[PDB]
Symmetry: D2
């Protein structure tokens, strides 16, 4: 292992990890300096060779590293207790480069039916070009996973947990055991969880990736990807990264480094407001169903308590109406923004049906759980009383 | 007033005030855009005249305003419930331009003996050049204040509350009543308080100013000044501001706007860690004395209790030793940085005697409460446990 | 197409294109605002649907667009006279996404032996998984391009011009004609040229791509990729871009927008110095050979003369000596930095043999023109004399 | 002394001064890092004392210095060949703090009738409060300067050169001689000149100040002040600066440092385009008069030519018409923005009468040379022919 022996809490680590004990870019400043350079120089050809023969250290070129960015790399690696972390231009950049680098051509992949749409698309339209075939199972169906592990020769099992938008959870520890038994790799996307509500690496997953665009940055003002794990693995991705070059700008790395100084304070507040609002809603006449790993209704709520310490700040529920009525509800809200993304100080609402499946036919949408009813609420950091009042006032107009 | 009728808590306000309902710089973005421009253009001379005849609105020149900065102006004005707010390059810039604009040549000023040093210096070396004579009383001595208000024709009473470094408090409501009776103006520097722990304006003060470099920004990465109050008054300062031009850079205004999205979460935490640690220290056999409005041993813990809701994140205490021993203690700490300033996520420690009065003789230092013993601790946002352990471990080396 | 009818010079265009006539993000500011947002909101579900049915415009999510970035997109599109431009995280990101989006699986690609190493690697190790196969010819050998354009069906001919590090040039017009005859696509990497020294699009190329990390940004403080061309084509890449998500940060987009305000002034000076010094060196005894399209000795000086108004700021030459001696020369220089990259105000020197092929055996290096002799000089914007003096003084130590 | 012995041109200096040989903030990066911190920490009380006893170096607090800012301080000091330079929040901030720090209470000041308005106001409404009396002479009237230098005791002679908006010049060398004879101090505002077109320090002036908001930054996206001169003098201002705290933000310091990498390339084009267009304008039947030091009709063209290598990028001329007609002209232009400020890549036009004296009566305006006729043109860096075409086309509508 860990950063500091005098830092035993994730909050204290999220703050000082990668900085308090030293930075690499020496300063007597309190904060990390933003280094805007596209290249690094050498004093003499002699030293350039040293570095080339691994006798000296240097990023050499901007596509291969940056001082103000490694800090953020070491900081996250600490939280996840990972051996090494790789930062990218975005979440989709992290998932994509990782799949291309770890799954061989032709090899098999296994994921749930709740896989992030964009990623599903990439897995079903691009990856096949290399013979890579897959198996889409149910988040819960471990039997399915078990079997696929035997007929086909699975290369990697990829899944998020919680899941979007129904927040389905996966038993990281159990799933990790099965896969490794048959040699498969396990990668968990803890975007909704956060490295504070769960330690996918600790539970057995080989790699844990995030979309820092959400909770990590937490201020809805920057995109970024995340992938932590063992050097041996993460460095294989880092290589293909140096070729595809989806590098992260130092200014972005800083906005995140800064945003993580209050990761704990933020996540804590979201967790409450979330849980608390869940119950209120689930017990509302105008709310048909409510999805939240905290509720007892949740199918894997037993897994949520056994592997998570918090249940997140995202809550999905179905209003008692139709596309139009549900819409009237979200239009009635006054604090959240009707927009995509989640995890930031500002609250956000959206109808997954209209916001991300409008391109499909009502039958094709429902073909995968998405209903005109479904509403996805990302609870901000505003006052619980202010929020709740707003949600209720809105449900009344329905 | 109130920004929004659906926003009743300071936390929700600190977040959406000046943005949620509209910005002036129209966007469909969630955040405020950083506008890096030194000048604003007009479409045709016709429109330039309109503006000149107050028929159109424009900042015209950068020294007179900026889109990404008014947001922060309107945001703070909301929290303080002020009619208008003016942002500057720094805290000292705010105090200084205000004194120069509101106190006439020859006029009289009244402040406590605990007045911020730099400001005391400005009041005792610069202001006299303009005939401005001053009276220095004790923060508590309300009698002296009442006499000055009677002998001389006081122009303005300026004081911070809490005070530095002993955190002395002033009865804003009482003091405000006396002054206004004799026509004096009252300006309170709520830097240590924060617009969350108290409402200087509500209690009667005419103007409340802050040093956003501390708690408002909260990330130890930007300097800024603050002055909120009624238009009639704050606009008089704004004018002199356009001539002295200590403008605030848009990039600074944004780093603060961002920093204020978690003001409540941060202050709240800082309020605990402080009060609690204040109690442990008070009961420690190695700590000679402890200053904190939250404690009962505080001279004005009774005034602080009635006019404030929280007690700040700063705690001053005297170790049981001398310059050298006290130093050994701070050198023993492992989490805080030995440095100036306070109010940010990172904890900071300093010995006011060495850090700000080393230029004076031991006799001149003690001539105003500063002892080689005194330690000033700005509690970060790290875990209370990690913090408590560190402070104790250090006190043991003594 | 032309941006403005009142702007007839590339210099005036590089400056006002995408801004002077309007921005989309309305302001009375002179410059483009940096919009730091990860998502864009909608006023009511109604408007969200409009947008979804192409009745309204919005970027929706940050991975799909940004106000402060389109400006830079429209600005470059103007310079190249392109129908549309796409900006990415880096040069390698631009090349890579384009290849993956335009060349089908099993398809065929054709490029020169002077192809950018990293890109060659991607073409020889990654692309093959998709069944894609390539044909590597000589920059000059047009007969080969002709044969290859026949024996096997070519999907796209990709080449840079000038080339690195020998600056070989390709007859864009001729080459474009042959390919299109056999239905192949033509993509030219004008990195070294700049949209000012040549118009690959005008000469017939379908797509022209750049690495804005070099000349476009011109200050060695930001990475970025570029791809301009017809909507029909560039939009196909833009799509795969929204999945692979190697988005460009708004802060980067601005640093480049800003850097292009002096693109013309910079390229001009770099152009003169390059040429003149090119000449001086060629006559210098200690200098063996000199590569520069400007010189009369350049194999394709006629094509350079024919399709370029400028010859760039990069000059490659071989010192009279060996790895060690050549090194002693570059170590003797005092103004340039020994480092990778080029195109910025600061001059830079490097020995391609040590800096990018050290991983290969002397025999494998020479196996492709790279010699321990070869030096690559990127002329800055410093004064011509200061530079000449320095280069001569250094050549004397040899 | 000078910066580097291998850098003999102002262009090479503007680029590498304060960086090429070292920065203080150690890096292997090519550019200067932006250090966003409000405080600097110490390793142990021991070292804090060292620093306090001038045995160690540190900025201590942000109001007292910053790493990314000193670079810009050392860079400008090099250009002006000054002993030390102080950077502020704006030009007005630099002028103001300097006057308050150098002119004693009751002291006497001497300046021209063409003094920057804002500054004149400060000198005529604030300074008198401390009894600082002033003498306003004609830029040319040296006899008056000799008399005032002999009647009342002059403390400092302050003037800009060229002047605004008529660009009047002052013989720095002669004026410097007279003042120093009578002990007066000489401060020259070279804003319009630039440290490239003249060396006020070399000509004898004690202090030379600039408004980096104009030419130095050159991109119309940042405000900043400047004051260079001998340590003994500049440090006296730096002190009062630490109290009034109108500090410069590191992000601003960087935008300027970056903007100065092409100071020479930009000033060159502005120098030409200006001069040339001045002639063409004076030869036009619709232009009543033209002010430019480079013209032969300029009252001090003989002094300009003698102490200047360029004449600036600003040109003021009077159209043959009235407020309304002149307006119709500027409204007809298509490239420049109708706005305040000057010195940047984008061209700007304005009518000093409407833009800065509209508050006065026609009689009061004319009371000081400002006519409804007067137009002030700040030539950008756009192409000369695009600029000339536009100006002519507009003059035709008149
Ligand atoms: C948002 C999200 C992503 C995409 O991350 P970007 O930063 O937008 O690329 C991937 N996975 C999950 C589960 C997400 O919620
Ligand atoms: C820090 C502080 C100031 C000074 O503010 P700056 O931002 O440093 O100028 C003024 N008053 C108090 C009470 C402070 O704590
Ligand atoms: C530098 C360069 C690239 C790579 O661009 P990045 O911005 O480093 O990814 C590609 N092609 C050429 C010809 C280059 O010179
Ligand atoms: C613009 C200008 C100033 C004012 O500088 P700011 O940066 O606007 O405060 C002072 N003097 C002259 C001569 C100017 O041209």
């Amino acid at each position: 292992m860990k950063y500091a022996s005098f830092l035993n809490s994730d909050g204290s680590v999220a703050i000082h990890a990668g900085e308090r004990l030293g930075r690499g870019i020496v300063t007597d400043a309190i904060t990390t300096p933003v280094v805007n350079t596209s290249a690094y120089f050498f004093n003499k050809t002699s030293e350039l060779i040293d570095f080339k023969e691994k006798r000296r250290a240097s990023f050499e070129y901007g596509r291969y590293g940056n001082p103000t960015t490694v800090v953020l790399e070491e900081k996250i690696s600490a939280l996840e207790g990972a051996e090494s972390t790789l930062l990218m231009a975005s979440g989709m950049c992290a998932s994509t480069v990782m799949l291309l680098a770890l799954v061989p051509a032709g090899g098999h992949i296994v994921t749930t039916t709740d896989c992030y749409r964009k990623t599903r698309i990439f897995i079903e339209t691009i990856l096949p070009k290399m013979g890579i075939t897959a198996t889409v199972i149910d988040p819960a169906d471990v039997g399915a996973l078990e079997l696929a592990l035997n007929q086909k020769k699975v290369n990697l099992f990829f899944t998020e947990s919680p899941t979007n938008p129904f927040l389905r959870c996966v038993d990281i520890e159990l799933v990790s055991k099965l896969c490794h038994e048959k040699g498969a790799l396990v990668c968990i996307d803890g975007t909704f969880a956060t490295p504070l509500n769960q330690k996918a690496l600790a539970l057995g997953a080989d790699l844990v990736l995030h979309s820092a665009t959400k909770f990590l940055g937490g201020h809805n003002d920057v995109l970024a990807g995340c992938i932590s794990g063992p050097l041996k693995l993460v460095s294989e991705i880092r290589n293909l990264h140096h070729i595809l070059g989806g590098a992260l700008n130092p200014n972005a790395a800083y906005l995140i480094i800064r945003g993580m100084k209050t990761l704990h304070l933020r996540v804590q507040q979201q967790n409450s407001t979330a849980l608390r609002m869940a119950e209120i809603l689930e017990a509302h006449p105008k709310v048909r169903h409510v999805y939240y790993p905290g509720l007892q209704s949740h199918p894997e709520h037993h897994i949520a308590k056994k592997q998570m310490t918090g249940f997140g700040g995202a809550v999905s529920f179905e209003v008692d109406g139709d596309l139009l009525t549900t819409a009237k509800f979200v239009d009635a809200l006054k604090i959240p923004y009707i927009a995509p993304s989640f995890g930031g100080c500002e609250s956000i609402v959206d109808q997954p049906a209209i916001m991300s499946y409008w391109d499909l036919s009502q039958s094709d949408r429902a073909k995968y759980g998405i209903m005109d009813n479904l509403v996805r609420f990302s609870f901000g950091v505003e006052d619980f009383d202010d929020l709740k009042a707003d949600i209720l006032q809105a449900l009344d107009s329905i």
